[PDB]
Sequence to fold (721 residues):
Amino acid sequence: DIVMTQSPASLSASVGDTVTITCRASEFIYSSLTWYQQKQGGSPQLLVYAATNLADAVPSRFSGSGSGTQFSLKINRLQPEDFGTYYCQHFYGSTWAFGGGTKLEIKRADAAPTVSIFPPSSEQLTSGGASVVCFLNNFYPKDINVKWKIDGSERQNGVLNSWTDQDSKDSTYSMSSTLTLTKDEYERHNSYTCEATHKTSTSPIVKSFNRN
Amino acid sequence: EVQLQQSGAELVKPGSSVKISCKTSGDSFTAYNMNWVKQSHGKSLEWIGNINPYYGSTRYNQKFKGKATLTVDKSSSTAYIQLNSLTSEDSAVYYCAREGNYYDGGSVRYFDYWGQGTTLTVSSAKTTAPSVYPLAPVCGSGSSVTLGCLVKGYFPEPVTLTWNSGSLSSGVHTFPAVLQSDLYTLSSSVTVTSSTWPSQSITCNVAHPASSTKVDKKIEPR
Amino acid sequence: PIMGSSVYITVELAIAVLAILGNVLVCWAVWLNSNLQNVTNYFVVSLAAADILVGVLAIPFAITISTGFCAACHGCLFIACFVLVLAQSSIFSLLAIAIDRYIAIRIPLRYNGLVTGTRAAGIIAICWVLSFAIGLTPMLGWNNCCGEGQVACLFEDVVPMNYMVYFNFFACVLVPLLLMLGVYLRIFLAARRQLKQMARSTLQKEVHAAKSLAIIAGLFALCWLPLHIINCFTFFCPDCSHAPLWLMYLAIVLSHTNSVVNPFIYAYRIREFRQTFRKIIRSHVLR
Ligand SMILES: CCn1c(=O)c2c(nc(/C=C/c3ccc(OC)c(OC)c3)n2C)n(CC)c1=O
Ligand SMILES: [Cl-]
Ligand SMILES: [K+]
Fold:
């Protein structure tokens, strides 16, 4: 079955600048390729059909191009509304596929994360669980990495992560990391540390606590 | 303008089956193929298959042959899809979409109109209520202080987590549910000027409508 | 007559080879590209299929007939009359396209139910049979019958003129051609009205395509009409100087010309063909 290759997976841009997205077919599909737009919690909207044809009510600032294996969609003059995920899809032969998709995002000045660590609630200790929590808030760009450390020794085991999307206010990201151990085992070690490496800071930003 | 109206969210046991509706309206249902599309992991988009509603003939993607089953009821203008031996890999949003078609020398082909989509959630987990843990900072300088809430081990989604009954709104980040084993976990943070706490009360309000529960934990200094 | 004869004999074979290459490239393009395998195009093949055999057979026939060679009358008529069966299966295809395009654009919503692969194939098969019946009825017994068992073959002597004007022209060419006209006129004028007040974008696009296939039909008529209109004067007015041989040879060739243009129009007007023509020339000849 023909594989589509969409690039870039992600791309950030300010309102009112020009952008292009690429779709490669693993076989010659001539002009049989459609572009679609998906906003948060919406269905795909048909954007371009037949490689080069604007769907009705799509603004003229949108336009697709190409033939055979290489097709690009160009969005001329970005508007607030244009941010969202974009997919290509072929319609050659009897069995079709899509691209990986392309999250168009808002670009803003680099921001370093506000790291905050939390020991386990007495509530939770009481119930025989121990969860240590780390909040990395209001950072750009989205690329970040988080090590957990118990008495200096790294822990990979039972750590669960979550990510927000671009804050509607300041276009930043945020992230939550929850290290979870048996209460018995939380009692053995005495130092818990959350070690976050981002672009904005060359040495990793560290936050920690001791059971005093 | 064809109007596609799908069925509502389903929640079914592994091994079970499930039949999602797509009611077309205000155009010829039998004039054009009705396709299905699976959006999985929030980004990935697969083509499941299509049906020619006139002839009731089906073309399936190999992947979904022996999972998906495209039926059609012509009288009502309703396209169905049935999914069998459901496993957790099946949990995704499924869309019906109408395939436009004309001749310019070739057969032109595009999904022009799409349903609102339908959430299938497959789990053998039992309806379970959250443990809500308060997160206060370490004992012992920031201009603004950050406090947390941890909602551990509930099923199914969703919950509603608000601060001081919604009144406290600025400075809040509430994070997507991640599966912890077969249950769910979620977290929320809130930041406020140093003198706002512990000076003023601040409470984490969690509603789990699936277990008709409600829990308010006040963040208290350790 | 060593000089004048010769320009004809070449201009003919020139055209004969264009018709083989231009229309093999059509037929290849369809075999290759799925996007081209649709009902409308199976008829554009049945047309290419024919305009091919004009080059391979009809023109050689038209050249040996040119001389006035000797043959038995029945084995002679076949050479004379094989161009006629092809001319026929051209008009059947040209019409089948025009009606396919009527349905698709006037009654879009029922096109799916109505037009299908299987039916197109059967229609094509039926027409080819009629095409043979209509093409060589003079073989059936409506004919006009050096060496003692032979006959000097000249078209206008073995094929009867009343068959040529009534049953071939009026009946089998002028009628389908007219009601082709009726059909395209209704599509375009309907659309002109329909576009002005109101998928708007989609109609334009499937129309544009029709204008293309319509222009094919246009040229068929332009190419054949002169020759048929001569067959009328030659017959209906015997109190008229019979059209001279230079004007005769012109319209004989003008007709053969029609088997060449079809592929050039597909290229100059229709992207999906142009792209498949390009890709065949690029990948298979240039590599
Ligand atoms: C079916 C369509 N059609 C025709 O209708 C047709 C024709 N050749 C002639 C005529 C040939 C001809 C006429 C007068 C001549 O000399 C007085 C003559 O001698 C060369 C040939 N006609 C009328 N050919 C060529 C095969 C033809 O295809
Ligand atoms: Cl009508
Ligand atoms: K459209």
In short: The pocket of chloride ion (ligand 2) is lined by residues C 106 (CB under 6 Å). The CA atoms of residues 140 and 151 of chain A lie 30 Å apart. Chain A touches chain C at residues 28, 30-32, 53-56, 67-68, 92-94 (CB under 8 Å).
